[model samples]
Target: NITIYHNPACGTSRNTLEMIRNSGTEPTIILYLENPPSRDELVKLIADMGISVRALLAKNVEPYEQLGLAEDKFTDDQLIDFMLQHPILINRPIVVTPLGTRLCRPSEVVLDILQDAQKGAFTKEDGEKVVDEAGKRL
Candidate 1:
């Protein structure tokens, strides 16, 4: 089975979910805001996605600047702790399967999980609209 860390309020997240459905594979939808995953689980997911810790987080979130996260020289634990306390700081629509996980930025990365599930049958590039001039479509 596949897991999709979803946030319905996010347009990109919604679009990504739609893409997954069109791909013909139904995954477990985890509305992360209502049922946030554990820090340990996020850590493992990030590893499986083959992305750095930063990729799992929302760089443009206010807390990143308000909390001085960039200037603080935070350790991994500190970052994880922040993500645990403020789930919004983490990126949305992280899709995962037994094979691996993917940070669905630009909504395109979800294809990675789909490909894994289908055994390399498909591939995807960057999504059409990652963000608009105003901000995240959410």
Candidate 2:
């Protein structure tokens, strides 16, 4: 099983989800914007992902600039708290499988942790090829 913190409005998030399904498993999907994670949940996810809170933060969201996140120097916990208040500040398409957890930014990044059986050559929504028909990474 896998879990994806998804934002359907985001192309990369949709692309990442499609790639995960192509890989052979229908993952647990969390429409995070509508159902935001609690601080503990977000913290655990960050820990599980083995990344800094900054890595998981989305600075492109409206609240990011409105709340001065980019200019402010806050601690990781503070950033988490900010994300807790503004769910949109959390980056999209964070995928967690038994193999590992990752913030699938390019969407294709999810391939790194997916099982070989799950992976196959497919074109992205943007019409870009990620793998060859022979299952070779391109």
Candidate 3:
């Protein structure tokens, strides 16, 4: 099964979700803003993703700057605390599947671990071509 930590209002997140559907594998969507993972769950996800806690932060979000996260004074645990306290600090569309775990930033990154093949052509909401007409990644 595939699970996506989703934020509906975000285009990148939407695009990533759509790709998962396009691959014929209906994914489990987690509206993380409304239902953030618990502290232990978040920690496990970060570890499974094999990325730094800082990397999981949504740097462009207002909360990141509002909280002075760019100062580099925060340790990994501190960053995790900030993320848990303000879930908005967590970056979007982190995907998990049996193949691997990843933060699907540009949307197409989700294609790497999809459980099924793309059913058809795909275009990002902004009209970026990600897959060709033959249902193959471009």
Candidate 4:
């Protein structure tokens, strides 16, 4: 089983969902804005994705600036709270397999996660160990 946390209004998110659908993977598309993640779930996803709280954020979102988030020092709980209050702050196309989770913004990696889901591996891409601004490995 896989879950793609999606935002229907975002082009990239739509594209990612299309890719998943075209793959015939039958992944669950979670419209996080309509049914946002709980604080514990977001925290769990942070750990599962092996990312910092800020890494899971949509930095380009208006809320990121409007909320004065740049200066706010966030604890784990605070970060989760912010995401709950502002769903746009959460990253898109977060694919969760039974083994782990991956923020599939690039889209192609969702295929990889789906493959692992069948095998119960739940491994992230090799590049994810050291990611770049575009979520690729340097």
Q: How accurate is candidate 1 locally (lDDT)?
A: 0.72
Q: Please tell me which predicted candidate would have the highest TM-score against the true structure.
A: 3
TM-score of each: 0.76, 0.93, 0.93, 0.73
> lDDT of candidate 4 vs native?
0.69
Q: Give me the runs in candidate 1 sitting further than 4 Å from their true place.
A: 115-138
Candidates 1 and 3, the one with greater lDDT: 3
Candidates ranked by lDDT = 3, 2, 1, 4
> How well is each residue in 1-138 modelled by candidate 3, as lDDT tens digits?
889999999999999999999888888888888888999989999998888999899887888988889898999999988888888899999999999888898889888888777788899999899999887666
Candidate 4 displacement at residue 30 in angstroms: 1.4
Per-prediction backbone clash count: 0, 1, 0, 0
Reference-based lDDT, each prediction: 0.72, 0.86, 0.89, 0.69
What is the per-residue lDDT of model 1 for residues 1-138, given as tens digits with 9 covering 90 to 100? Answer: 777999888877887777677567788999886787897797887777787776576877888878887774887778888888888888888887665777787675665566522222222233454334443332
Worst 10 residues of 3 by lDDT: 129-138
Higher-lDDT candidate of 1 and 2: 2
Q: lDDT of model 3 at residue 75?
A: 94
Q: Among all windows of ten consecutive residues in candidate 4, which has the lowest summed lDDT?
A: 116-125
